[PDB]
Amino acid sequence: IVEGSDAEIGMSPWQVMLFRKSPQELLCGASLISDRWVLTAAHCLLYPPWDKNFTENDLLVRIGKHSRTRYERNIEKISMLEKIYIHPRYNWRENLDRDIALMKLKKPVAFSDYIHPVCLPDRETAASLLQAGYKGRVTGWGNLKETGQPSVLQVVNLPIVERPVCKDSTRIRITDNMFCAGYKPDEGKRGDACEGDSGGPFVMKSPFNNRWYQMGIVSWGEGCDRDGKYGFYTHVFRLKKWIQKVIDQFGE
Amino acid sequence: DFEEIPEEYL
Amino acid sequence: EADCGLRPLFEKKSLEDKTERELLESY
Ligand SMILES: CCOC(=O)CO/N=C(/c1ccccn1)C1(c2ccc3c(c2)nc(CNc2ccc(C(=N)N)cc2)n3C)CC1
């Protein structure tokens, strides 16, 4: 997270770390949506241009973490992957469209003060909050600058940007399954997700029921925190039906 | 610089 | 989920984190 700050303990209990066994390293960010389901970006698992195509056994999910590199004894829980499900229409060829994936854990994770699921938005929640200017929150253990690594989970609050502005900031073709966030050059404030943060959650706290909802998944960006550029996010609600069906098909 | 995690998960 | 989005160390004990108000002020 570029220009973020250290997370408070228990501030993001749904934060999950996609961790590679060999060599042991951070692969991506992710989120806890139930005791057996973790949500992340499809590109974290499958991304041919970067020679990425992990199988369940290559991965480990670390939940309840705060510190980046330290094994948090008596706090974090490390789960194994039973199955990986990538959106059947995720398009890594043209533009990372429908960049979403579900990972079912081998056995249910126990909730605690540091482990708790975030909500997925319903049509109405999405309609009211997914508006230009409304701020969401991005968290992760990714790079602090485009060109080090944090000691602790980082967090930054970023405003949703008008679609025309998002489109006019890049040569990439934006789809409806994406939204962008971040400050404009004249807005003064800054911050953005960066390498190591992708797959992570973009959440918003509904002022209607005071619950946190995951509106986006860190998907792509051109550099990190560059003036005139914005972080792009998978529109979670637009692809919820796929989520529901997977969870009600192979789910538990 | 990742600290060794219980070999039990590997 | 019936208890989703309510944090044990915050919402559950009516404590607010240091920057959530920034979010709410933008809505
Ligand atoms: C390094 C050279 O790359 C290239 O020449 C072409 O990159 N092509 C694209 C692209 C994006 C969307 C649709 C089509 N093509 C890209 C690109 C492509 C795939 C990407 C990507 C960035 N970023 C990620 C994941 N990591 C990531 C996510 C968000 C970030 C941010 N908000 N600053 C910073 C990093 N994945 C996964 C340059 C922006």
In short:
The PDB classes it as hydrolase/hydrolase inhibitor. The complex is a heterotrimer of chains A (252), B (10) and C (27). Chain A is mainly β and 252 residues long.
Features:
heterotrimer, A: 252 residues, mainly beta, Thrombin, subunit H, 2 domains, 7-stranded antiparallel sheet, 6-stranded antiparallel beta barrel, globular, B: 10 residues, little secondary structure, 0% helix, 0% strand, elongated, binds ligand T87, Thrombin heavy chain (chain A), Hirudin-2B (chain B)
Structural class of chain B: little secondary structure
Radius of gyration of chain B: 7 Å
| Approximate shape of chain B | elongated
Q: Which CATH top level class of chain C fits?
A: Few Secondary Structures
Distance between the termini of chain C: 24 Å
SSE sequence of chain C, one letter per element: H
Strand elements of chain C, count = 0
Overall number of domains of chain C? 1
Structural class of the helix and strand makeup of chain C? mainly alpha
* Rg calc of chain C: 10 Å
What is the assembly state of the chains in this entry? heterotrimer
Give the amount of beta strand of chain C, in percent.
under 5%
CATH fold-level topology of chain C: Epsilon-Thrombin, Chain L
Instruction: Report the span from N to C terminus of chain B.
Output: 17 Å
- What spatial form of chain C do the alpha-carbon principal axes imply? flat
Q: Care to describe what's here?
A:
The complex is a heterotrimer of chains A (252), B (10) and C (27). Chain A is mainly beta and 252 residues long. Chain A contains three helices and 15 strands. Chain A folds into two domains: 132 residues, Thrombin, subunit H, CATH 2.40.10; 118 residues, Thrombin, subunit H. In chain A, strands 1-11-10-13-14-15-12 form a seven-stranded antiparallel beta sheet, with no helix packed on it. Chain A is globular. The relative contact order of chain A is 0.22. By secondary structure, chain C is mainly alpha-helical. Chain C is built from one helix and no strands. Chains in contact: A-B, A-C. The structure holds ligand T87. Chain A: This is Thrombin heavy chain. Chain B: Hirudin is a potent thrombin-specific protease inhibitor. It forms a stable non-covalent complex with alpha-thrombin, thereby abolishing its ability to cleave fibrinogen. Chain B: It is found in: Secreted. Chain B: Belongs to the protease inhibitor I14 (hirudin) family.
